[PDB]
Amino acid sequence: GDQRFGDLVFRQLAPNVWQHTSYLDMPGFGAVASNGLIVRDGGRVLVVDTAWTDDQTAQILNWIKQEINLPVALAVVTHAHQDKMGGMDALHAAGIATYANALSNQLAPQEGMVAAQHSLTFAANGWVEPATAPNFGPLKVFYPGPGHTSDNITVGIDGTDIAFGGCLIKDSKAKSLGNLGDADTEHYAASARAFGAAFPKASMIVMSHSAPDSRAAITHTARMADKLR
Numbered sequence: 001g002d003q004r005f006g007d008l009v010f011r012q013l014a015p016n017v018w019q020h021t022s023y024l025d026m027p028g029f030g031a032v033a034s035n036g037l038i039v040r041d042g043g044r045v046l047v048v049d050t051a052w053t054d055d056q057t058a059q060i061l062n063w064i065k066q067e068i069n070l071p072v073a074l075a076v077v078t079h080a081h082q083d084k085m086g087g088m089d090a091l092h093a094a095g096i097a098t099y100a101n102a103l104s105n106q107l108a109p110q111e112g113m114v115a116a117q118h119s120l121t122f123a124a125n126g127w128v129e130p131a132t133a134p135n136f137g138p139l140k141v142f143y144p145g146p147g148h149t150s151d152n153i154t155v156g157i158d159g160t161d162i163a164f165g166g167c168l169i170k171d172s173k174a175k176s177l178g179n180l181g182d183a184d185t186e187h188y189a190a191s192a193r194a195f196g197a198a199f200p201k202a203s204m205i206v207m208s209h210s211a212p213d214s215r216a217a218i219t220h221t222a223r224m225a226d227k228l229r
């Protein structure tokens, strides 16, 4: 069930996993949802993606304090756009360790964003070098190649059926790939399929802006990306 907390929505997806949802009223597009994850592991919480704003991200922290009451060990963000990185300063104000793709931390200031404190590096084949992602527990992090943005990264949650492509992936009903302003049109299709190949056992694909979808979301996305080349 959708749990309301100030202006945000939280939905439990699995015993240790919640989706956080924040909204931006965007003229001509309506109220736009943005989703991230909250993962409980041991006696701590891990956050995937900020909300659109610092104020909303602070509300994520207030919800975690009230409903879970365990420390937030770290946050990782999936790309340097406002919907996923717009609340980075709220995390730093709360003393949370933050992580992003090295490329995201390089891009962040020009994107009007605050960089994460820690940079991730990726093996040639896209899996995060674990030494750059300490204490990530069940959070498995994978750079699929450039797509929605050059810096986009993806996460799977070990011990669940859940993976999250962020804005790389569109749901199975999408009428476009959306914002291609920062997209790599050459590599998009390959990166979407690489995400599917990295997390072959994931049946619940958490969507960046809509309800969770099946693996049809990944195939629909790569098929739309094929038309970009």
Ligand SMILES: Cc1c(CP(=O)(O)O)c2ccc(Br)cc2n(CC2CCCC2)c1=O
Pocket (backbone or CB within 6 Å): 028, 029, 167, 177, 178, 179, 180, 208, 209
């Ligand atoms: C969720 C969503 C996005 C965000 P993303 O870049 O991650 O795909 C989006 C982006 C650009 C355009 Br142009 C339309 C979009 N739409 C459709 C609009 C919302 C309803 C009217 C069209 C999205 O839903």
Ligand SMILES: Cc1c(CP(=O)(O)O)c2ccc(Br)cc2n(CC2CCCC2)c1=O
Pocket (backbone or CB within 6 Å): 026, 029, 032, 081, 082, 083, 167, 178, 179, 180, 181
């Ligand atoms: C940066 C940006 C986002 C965030 P992301 O691309 O990460 O989803 C966005 C998201 C939803 C909608 Br609906 C429009 C959006 N717009 C404006 C549209 C982009 C193409 C024309 C307008 C964003 O700029």
Ligand SMILES: [Zn+2]
Pocket (backbone or CB within 6 Å): 079, 080, 081, 148, 149, 167, 179
């Ligand atoms: Zn984006």
Ligand SMILES: [Zn+2]
Pocket (backbone or CB within 6 Å): 083, 166, 167, 208, 209
């Ligand atoms: Zn998006």
